Design a binder for this molecule. Structure first.
Ligand SMILES: O=c1ccn([C@@H]2O[C@H](COP(=O)(O)OP(=O)(O)O[C@H]3O[C@H](CO)[C@H](O)[C@H](O)[C@H]3O)[C@@H](O)[C@H]2O)c(=O)[nH]1
Ligand SMILES: O=c1ccn([C@@H]2O[C@H](COP(=O)(O)OP(=O)(O)O[C@H]3O[C@H](CO)[C@H](O)[C@H](O)[C@H]3O)[C@@H](O)[C@H]2O)c(=O)[nH]1
Ligand SMILES: [Fe+3]
Ligand SMILES: [Fe+3]
Ligand SMILES: [K+]
Ligand SMILES: [K+]
Ligand SMILES: [Zn+2]
Ligand SMILES: [Zn+2]
Lengths: 347, 344
């Protein structure tokens, strides 16, 4: 038989992590008698008097939020890391070893509007968010080699607070992902003479099967090696080391691409579409970071619909990630919808 | 100041995978206004006339299940892998490349009792289950180097059917987990001249702080580098390459261990505790595998209660896993309950 990626299971390589992805084209034809997701509520207030994240409201700790009108950043009340944690007793023990961990955690409210998600925000507003991401990265980076910007959107994605926003966690070390991506890029670079993702963006621009968003300065695709159903990879077209390096143009442009990508996401099932996303850029380790290329990852769980998600368990935990749909199928369905939030379009 | 693992964040190494785990011991004190789980129904019938897995029932494909006793294994009606899949196009491209993927997938019904989960089954029954895992393993190992026994239990664990059971998927390659565990274990052995998990086992024996279940032949602990809140690692005290290598005693003993471990898990929150579990053993690759050590992993999502789970998202996806309680605190919680099923 002729090999048919659409019907034939195969494995794809993720050069960023060095891991394989199992693709099993028809897996989703099976009966689904499992959990049924709960789609988001259609009626929220712009201000929730009981929301710890709302403006002019008191946090769980009694501390009062300012009367913020834009973005708002504050040290997380339950930080995951601290700047002064004492050093751990480090050994060379090949069985049980530990290491120190310092840093901080900040929370960012995208806006005071309790009911407005990224896709529903102005490009201006979005531009503010980027500026904030930048401001945060630069300050923190002055102190920690790894600054991780991220966001958890929706209950299916473990958010513990319903207010629109993200987080930043700084680390004194290079976390798993960062060390891996760092090393792999560096090796590619040393070998190929060019940045791995810079070349990748080129190939994708020329192909288009996996393209979901394209703007002047940005490209969002369902990466070849994507793991989650509708996972996307957001990259600048030009070579950029960190978020702090973007020009104001690439910056306002980013806002636009974000609006587009998130709008498509919500348009996919005509509902708030949950996910975990975050930025990866060169570490502030004072080294040669030429091999780096700034990028954002979007890991959403929804699969068959608004109430049917993908579960990365069982074989996927004990062996390897296994996808039901191809990256090409995913991109296609994403290209199919409008890039204007249904709420904004009125359609 | 003086470091205190229960007060100070730090990172622990997973030598099986070469990955680090971020420990942040006070994280679960933050308010939780997120999702609430829905705990498994306590009352179900022994036979469901609409269940695809029940004895004598007709599957989705019209195929009819026999009036089986004990376990029942069948080829998955929607197998993720096939024996004859055409080879893929092999390239060495540094950006976009693929590889062939062959194998099979089987479904294992633990027993005819649609209502009896693992901890609720007799040791005898549990033994039959182990015999089947063995049979399957030896069978499939004849053709595939990688045999994956596993189980998805509970809606929270993306199980797609309620009947009690698991799955066995075989592969023509070594999946990610398998390749790294093989490599790291091999490297350790070359250096220590002893199997990594075998030594591990001893070290835990001489500690007990992470111990959760211990029988004559088995040991179950919350591994030092555990990821999931109440994650356990279940392994034989003696060097065993694969599940098919177990002695009859070791096997009957595994059934016991299992019952004990699972009863403890259900007793933790007094509910059917969800998880994904699976066995890791030597591959059937004709190679020198003395560095291997059979072992089972249990990855349960529950954290705060029967309605509040742990979500491995955000920072955890983008950087590294972050635990809210230490392995020691977890193990302690597990030990505190009876190993007798609250409703046995
Ligand atoms: O008065 C308050 C109320 C809440 N918070 C903080 O607001 C945050 C809300 O952020 P998220 O909704 O993104 O999620 P959490 O940080 O609560 O937890 C989630 O994100 C983590 C980081 O990725 C882990 O993955 C975790 O398992 C997952 O549930 C929490 O950190 C909480 O500590 C405050 O600082 N003050
Ligand atoms: O008539 C039927 C009905 C069902 N099945 C099979 O019975 C299995 C039920 O097994 P599980 O409940 O453990 O879960 P699934 O295999 O359906 O899927 C889960 O397990 C997979 C392997 O871990 C993936 O991780 C997937 O994302 C996850 O949701 C399914 O594979 C289904 O194909 C049949 O063979 N015949
Ligand atoms: Fe990355
Ligand atoms: Fe293992
Ligand atoms: K959020
Ligand atoms: K099951
Ligand atoms: Zn609010
Ligand atoms: Zn049944």
């Amino acid at each position: 038989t002729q090999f048919n990626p659409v019907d034939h299971p195969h494995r794809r390589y993720n050069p960023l992590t060095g891991q394989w992805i199992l693709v099993s084209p028809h897996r989703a034809k099976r009966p689904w008698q499992g959990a049924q997701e709960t789609p988001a509520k259609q009626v929220l207030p712009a201000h929730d008097p009981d929301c710890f994240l709302c403006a002019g409201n008191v946090r769980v700790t009694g501390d009062k939020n300012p009367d913020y009108t834009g973005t708002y950043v504050f040290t997380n009340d339950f930080a995951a890391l601290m700047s002064d944690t004492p050093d751990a007793p480090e050994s060379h023990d090949p069985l049980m070893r530990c290491q120190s961990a310092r840093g901080t955690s900040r929370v960012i409210c995208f806006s005071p509007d309790h009911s407005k998600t990224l896709p529903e925000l102005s490009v201006a507003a979005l531009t503010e968010i980027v500026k904030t991401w930048q401001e945060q990265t630069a300050e923190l980076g002055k102190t920690y080699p790894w600054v991780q910007v991220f966001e958890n959107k929706g209950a299916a994605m473990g958010c513990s607070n319903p207010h629109p926003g993200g987080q930043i966690w700084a680390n004194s070390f290079l976390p798993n992902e960062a060390e891996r991506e760092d090393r792999l890029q560096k090796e590619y670079f040393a070998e190929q003479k060019s940045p791995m993702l810079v070349d990748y963006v080129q190939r994708e621009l020329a192909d288009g099967s996996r393209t979901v968003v394209e703007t002047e300065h940005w490209l969002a695709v369902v990466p070849y090696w994507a793991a989650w159903p509708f996972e996307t990879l957001l990259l600048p077209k030009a070579h950029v080391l960190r978020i702090t390096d973007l020009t104001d143009a690439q910056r306002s442009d980013l806002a636009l691409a974000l609006k587009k990508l998130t709008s498509r996401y919500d348009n996919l099932f005509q509902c708030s579409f949950p996910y975990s996303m975050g930025w990866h850029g060169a570490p502030f380790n004072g080294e040669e970071n030429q091999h780096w290329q700034l990028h954002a990852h979007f890991y959403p769980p929804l699969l068959r619909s608004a109430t049917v998600r993908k579960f990365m368990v069982g074989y996927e935990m004990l062996a390897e990630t296994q996808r039901d749909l191809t990256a090409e199928q995913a991109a296609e369905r994403l290209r199919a919808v409008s890039d204007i939030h249904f709420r904004e379009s009125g359609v």
